[PDB]
């Protein structure tokens, strides 16, 4: 947590890999690369009941705990890669996505570039569930 970085105005970047599935939300800051990571706290790490692991509140608590951990190391700004469950599963990002991004837009982190890395298959394997689907 001591870098020879110029301290005033010139920003120090990481990229936060916000992976919002429908049953958990992962706010995970890494470097510019992704190879070395900085902070990772999830929805389920904060709120201790399984149904509100994916709540937008649980994802907010995470991104607040991410951001204040990220200011100790002095990574000022964040690039963003938003991600849904993806593959053959759902491409619409989870409910915790926006609240978690807003949480480190309210914390004090500068926002770099936002994109989707939702692992979109060109052409997929077979999907879990039947011919007749997931009945209820």
């Amino acid at each position: 947590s001591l870098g020879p970085q110029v301290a005033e105005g010139e920003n120090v970047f990481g990229v936060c890999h916000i992976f919002a599935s429908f049953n958990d939300t992962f706010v995970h800051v890494t470097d510019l690369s992704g190879k070395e990571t900085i902070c990772r706290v999830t929805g389920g790490m904060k709120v201790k009941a399984d149904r509100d692991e994916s709540s937008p509140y649980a994802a907010m608590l995470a991104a607040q705990d991410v951001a204040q951990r990220c200011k100790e190391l002095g990574i000022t700004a964040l690039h963003i890669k938003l991600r849904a469950t993806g593959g053959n599963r759902t491409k619409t990002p989870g409910p915790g996505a926006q609240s978690a991004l807003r949480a480190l837009a309210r914390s004090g982190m500068k926002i770099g570039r936002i994109e989707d890395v939702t692992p979109i298959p060109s052409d997929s394997t077979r999907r879990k569930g039947g011919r007749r689907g997931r009945r209820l």
Partner: protein, 68 residues
């Protein structure tokens, strides 16, 4: 029981001269700790750098994988 982030050297990422904006960002790496070397586990990192961050005033829908 100990901080792993205590022992992170902070290295600069240079873009080749064909691009305008030189400095890309900052890459924390664990120091040489006996066998495994700082430069060793650093010489294959991809950087997904947008053109707008790399060339001065141009399109911001093009990215460039640059490896150390």
């Amino acid at each position: 029981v100990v901080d792993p982030f205590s022992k992170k050297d902070w290295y600069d990422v240079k873009a080749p001269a064909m691009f305008n904006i030189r400095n890309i960002g900052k890459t924390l790496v664990t120091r040489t700790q006996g066998t495994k070397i700082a430069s060793d586990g650093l010489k294959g990192r991809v950087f997904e750098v947008s053109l707008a961050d790399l060339q001065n005033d141009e399109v911001a829908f093009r990215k460039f994988k640059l490896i150390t």
